[PDB]
């Protein structure tokens, strides 16, 4: 809970496997995965 | 923003009555003492005067050089101070300046350019400068007064062109000396602007 | 210059005059003779000449047979030629004393040398130059295009040249602008705005941060730029697994896949269109096709069909009417399945019975056949009636039996009658097919 910024510089790229197909067990992840928002979101989740 | 725009410039004859008026815009003008800093042809500022604010007084400090000659006033509902300059020698050609500030000189202006000069406007002399064996070059001795402007080649050359900053005789007269460095042929034309008087001049050794 | 050389001119009238021409420059440089030679190329096809009265009167009139610009100038002077070379000190050096030749700057254009070159014969001996020797400005024209010019504005008060700007494009590849001057007769504002607009229309460069400076206008939000859209879209390699799911087998299912159609071209319809439908409910349905009806230039007829009326009472009453150019079924509209059948459907049957009685009618024009979401163009609900398809179904069909008498199925949204008053009009007049 402390003013800290994160600034993560990153490209779309291609990961997983092409949302509109989804997953078994990567399905509601996928999303929270291949996005280059939550890729600084997670980091300042997980340390607060 | 504090502009200080001067105006009332000119060419005078010695023992004349000139007028310097000084319109401030950007600041209240009756909080400040604005002064008159006079900078004779290249050489250091030497300060004329000052008037004191009128809640200050509006005492008139003015200089040793130029005490019962000049005299300086300020007005608020018209907002202008002036340098009165009476009984000019030749010592007032210069770029008088207009500070707002008695010992802390601030926006300082512009630069009203003041003549007195007992001359009167005559074409240059255009007398050529023969190579000893090199340079090239040209004077437009006696000629007043500035404006002037000299080319070579007629505005072609313009590498290693040198307009030497003119001049003054004790006659009142200016001379400048424009010279181009190049081995060899060329020419000069000098455009008195004043008399509107444009005389050219081809040289060789 | 120009008035010390125009003063001492004055005196050579009498003697020889100026003409100028847009004849080729081939045919007149052939026929010139008697003291007469070319002033000026001022094109392929324009050559201004030079030379004494009495032939160079008669080489207007020439050109008045060659129906070519013939002008006997009015401020007819001895230039070029040798009646002005003899005075080498008031037409030589009075007109220009005092000069001063300026550097690069932005490329001027000399003519009498035929390219763009500054000496010093041009501030001072370009006059000597000129009265001396021709003008080939056709030359310099031709070296204007070689270093990227084509817009050339005449400044005049008629346009003389610019008209033969265009003779130098009329024969050459870099055909060129020339923007019309002032016309003769022109001199006023309003004209001078109309060539600043044509120079702007050429290729002008105009700093319009200069002609409303004075005006103290503002400016207004205006529409922004019209995109003319393409359809530009890319479709994924790996969509679904690069097929429909699993796999895939060497057979291959169709589908329907409801594709955005025009809604047709409107065109002002005639004689009448028949909103043909029950009468059972009162219907906001009939109130909102209409409106666009009437308004398509028909009028607007009712014809109340009931369930199994008879395959003939509409034929006589579409007779009774007179001629019709379609009609639109909104017996289809919020209508549910009779739960006894659902082929059973009272409109399927009105429907058949209108399609044959338009026959039997021998009217000839195109039924429409409003359904409330009997289709969808997207699963974003449930089919309000599948029963209701089956007049689809039966549509398909009908077109190829009565391409005439069918003109299609005009689905809309269940309960929402807006989509009809938007686009019905030019749906059953649409030329889209």
């Known amino acids: 809970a402390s003013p800290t910024g994160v600034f993560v510089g990153l490209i779309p790229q291609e990961y997983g496997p092409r949302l509109a197909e989804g997953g078994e067990g990567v399905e509601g992840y996928l999303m929270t995965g291949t996005t280059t928002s939550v890729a600084s979101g997670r980091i300042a989740y997980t340390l607060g | 923003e504090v502009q200080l725009v001067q105006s009332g410039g000119g060419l005078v004859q010695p023992g004349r009555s000139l007028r310097l008026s000084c319109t401030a815009s950007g600041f209240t003008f009756g909080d400040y003492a604005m002064s008159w800093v006079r900078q004779a042809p290249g050489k250091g500022l030497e300060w004329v005067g000052f008037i004191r604010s009128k809640a200050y007084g509006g005492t008139t400090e003015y200089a040793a050089s130029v005490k019962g000659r000049f005299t300086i006033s300020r007005d608020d509902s018209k907002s202008i101070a002036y340098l009165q300059m009476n009984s000019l020698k030749t010592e007032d050609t210069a770029v008088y300046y207009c500070?707002?500030?008695?010992?802390?000189?601030?926006?300082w202006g512009q630069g009203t350019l003041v003549t007195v000069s007992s001359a009167s406007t005559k074409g240059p002399s255009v007398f050529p400068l023969a190579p000893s064996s090199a340079a090239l070059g040209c004077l437009v001795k006696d000629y007043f007064p500035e404006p002037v402007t000299v080319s070579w080649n007629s505005g072609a050359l313009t590498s290693g062109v040198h307009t030497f900053p003119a001049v003054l005789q004790s006659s009142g007269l200016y001379s400048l000396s424009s010279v181009v460095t190049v081995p060899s042929t060329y020419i000069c034309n000098v455009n008195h602007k004043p008399s509107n008087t444009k005389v050219d001049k081809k040289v060789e050794p | 210059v120009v008035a010390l050389r125009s003063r001492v001119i004055a005196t050579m009238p009498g003697n020889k005059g100026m003409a100028s021409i847009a004849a080729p420059a081939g045919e007149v440089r052939a026929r010139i003779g008697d003291r007469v030679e070319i002033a000026a190329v001022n094109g392929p096809r324009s050559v201004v000449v030079a030379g004494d009265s009495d032939e160079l009167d008669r080489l207007v009139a020439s050109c008045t047979t060659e129906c070519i610009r013939a002008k006997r100038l009015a401020v007819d002077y001895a230039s070029h030629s040798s009646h002005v070379e003899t005075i080498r000190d008031a037409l030589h050096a009075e007109l220009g004393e005092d000069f001063h030749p300026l550097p690069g700057f932005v490329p001027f254009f000399s003519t009498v040398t035929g390219r763009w070159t500054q000496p010093d014969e041009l501030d001072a001996g370009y006059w000597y130059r000129n009265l001396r020797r021709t003008v080939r400005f056709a030359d310099a024209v031709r070296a204007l295009a070689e270093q990227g010019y084509r817009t050339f504005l005449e400044v005049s008060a008629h346009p003389i040249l610019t008209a033969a700007i265009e003779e130098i494009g009329d024969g050459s590849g870099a055909d060129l602008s020339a923007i019309h001057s002032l016309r003769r007769g022109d001199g006023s504002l309003a004209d001078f705005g109309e060539a600043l607009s044509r120079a702007f229309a050429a290729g002008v460069a105009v700093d319009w941060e200069s002609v409303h400076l004075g005006t103290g206008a503002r400016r207004v939000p205006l529409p922004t730029y019209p995109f003319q859209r393409e359809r530009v879209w890319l479709e994924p390699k790996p969509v679904a697994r690069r097929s429909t799911e699993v796999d895939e087998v060497s057979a291959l299912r169709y589908r329907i896949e409801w594709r955005p159609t025009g809604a047709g071209e409107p065109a002002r319809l005639d004689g009448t269109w028949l909103v043909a439908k029950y009468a059972g409910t009162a219907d906001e349905t009939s109130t909102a096709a209409r409106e666009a009806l009437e308004s398509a230039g028909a009028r607007v007829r009712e014809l109340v069909v009931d369930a199994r009326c008879g395959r003939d009472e509409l034929a006589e009453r579409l007779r009774s009417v007179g001629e019709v150019a379609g009609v639109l079924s909104l017996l289809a509209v919020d209508e549910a399945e009779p739960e006894e059948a659902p082929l059973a459907l009272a409109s399927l049957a009105d429907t058949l019975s209108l399609v044959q009685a338009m026959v039997s009618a021998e009217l000839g024009c195109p039924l429409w056949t409003v359904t409330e979401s009997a289709v969808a163009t997207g699963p974003f609900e449930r089919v309000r009636n599948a029963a209701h398809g089956a007049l689809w179904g039966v549509g398909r069909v009908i077109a190829l039996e009565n391409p005439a008498v069918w003109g299609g199925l005009v689905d809309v949204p269940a309960g929402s009658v807006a989509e009809l008053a938007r686009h019905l009009a030019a749906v059953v007049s649409g030329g889209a097919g």
């Open positions: 500070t707002r500030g008695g010992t802390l000189f601030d926006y």
